[PDB]
């Protein structure tokens, strides 16, 4: 039963290109595919 | 389209080689809801 | 120091042919947010 309130008379400045939950969606999809599509051969550069 | 087996990962920098494709038929029913374009500013069209 | 050696490693896991159908994942906010 989701809770949703419409807020009266409020104005609010957003920003799309500086959201800090887009880098929290990016983390949990790196973490998805690495445990989802396990590959046969990786080639990850180490660069010591 | 193709089906490549040696891709570049989007996750980090690196390549990945996968198994051969599956034997049967492969269906895909996707609904395009978006593009990503890019211009090229010359000096016009 | 400029052309530094980058050892392109190769880790090989055990790779089956697995299914892949993305489900909708919606992000909730913890308590007090």
């Amino acid at each position, epitope marked *: 039963n989701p809770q949703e309130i419409h807020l009266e008379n409020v104005t609010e400045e957003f920003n799309m290109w500086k959201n800090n939950m887009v880098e929290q969606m990016h983390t949990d999809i790196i973490s998805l595919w690495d445990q989802s599509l396990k590959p*046969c051969v990786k080639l990850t550069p180490l660069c010591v | 389209c*193709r089906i490549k087996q*040696i891709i570049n990962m989007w996750q980090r920098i690196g390549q990945a080689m996968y198994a051969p494709p599956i034997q049967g038929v492969i269906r895909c029913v996707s609904n395009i809801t978006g593009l990503i374009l890019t211009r090229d500013g010359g000096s016009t069209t | 120091y400029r052309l530094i050696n980058c050892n392109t490693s190769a880790i*090989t896991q*055990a790779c089956p042919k697995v299914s892949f159908e993305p489900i909708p994942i919606h992000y909730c906010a913890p308590a007090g947010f």
Partner: antibody
Amino acid sequence: VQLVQSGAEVNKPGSSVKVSCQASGATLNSHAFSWVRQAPGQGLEWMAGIIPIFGSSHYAQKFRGRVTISADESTRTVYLHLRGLRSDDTAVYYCASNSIAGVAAAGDYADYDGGYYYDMDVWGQGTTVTVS
Amino acid sequence: QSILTQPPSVSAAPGQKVTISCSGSSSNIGNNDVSWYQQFPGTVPKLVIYENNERPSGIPDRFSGSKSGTSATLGITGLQTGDEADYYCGTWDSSLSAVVFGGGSKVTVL
């Protein structure tokens, strides 16, 4: 990484022989396997070979039909069956393999029928097959 | 049955240079790479030269290789006594669609 083969075999001509080759790795798809033999005192030659990352197999032109290669991924064993046993097959067999990962630096579309057997160093201990 | 024309034996005194030729067509060497393998009689063979000039870890740097035209030369500078084995050159023949070897080259100490 090391490879263990099957036990030595004695036989009569006309039958079919089986030699196994088990890998110590995690999967067979990272290695392009190969079967070479050595008649005692003579040179080396290449019988056949399988690459499971592309599902492709390869046969020498002197050995088509007589030789088949099967690989079981679930047990990580490369199998060789040789049909049409004759006199000169008194030899020792070897299963060898190299890393397949050298074609990731290729020009996008590789070649999925081509040959990527080169400079192996994972030769198993061998199996002596003697016909009578 | 030797498609590659390896000489059957090379010989020199211990502490010198030897050459081993691996001569083939323009569909096994002129387009592809060469390799070299070492086998003591009875024991399993061992790769000694990969990618025409390199050595794996555990190989002395006396073994050198080159690919000239349609043939290849293996050179052992400063021959020791512990090299009592025989050598094989192995390439991929594109026209024959198979890995192709040589007849063998048994080096001998003097």
